[PDB]
Symmetry: C2
Subunit: 80 residues, 2 copies
């Protein structure tokens, strides 16, 4: 049941300003830890710099709320 932990990741990410959905989330256990890779949607008219700031906020928010995560790589794509 990774459903429970993935549901938490998504919820957490979605509550960060500028996230327009979670497009992708791959999470796996490395021992008792989670390592994850996520793609978020953002406004296409955000700058690249803003997109990088939103990714960094999501990394902070998600890692703050889900203490078992030990690696979280966040990227962004335009979403309408």
């Amino acid at each position: 049941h990774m459903e429970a932990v993935q549901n938490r990741i998504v919820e957490a990410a979605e509550r960060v300003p500028g996230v327009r959905g979670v497009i992708h989330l791959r999470a796996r256990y490395v021992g008792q830890d989670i390592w994850a890779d996520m793609i978020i949607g953002v406004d296409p008219e955000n700058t690249v710099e803003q997109a990088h700031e939103i990714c960094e906020a999501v990394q902070a928010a998600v890692c703050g709320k889900i203490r078992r995560i030990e690696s979280l790589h966040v990227s962004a794509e335009a979403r309408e």
Copy 2:
């Protein structure tokens, strides 16, 4: 490691309007489920009716965020 689940319960409860701390939290596993009893602090000058509303909001907030909880009994005491 019930520390992780109890930390989540407390955080969740503390973010509900009118909670002035978690005074007490007993949580235990009943199979894979959590059953818990909690006392929250509230403003002494809240009415008894308001205190009951805050308890009901905490029950909702906590059970909404921690899906493994299958019983949560919330009571209130005055806290300055």
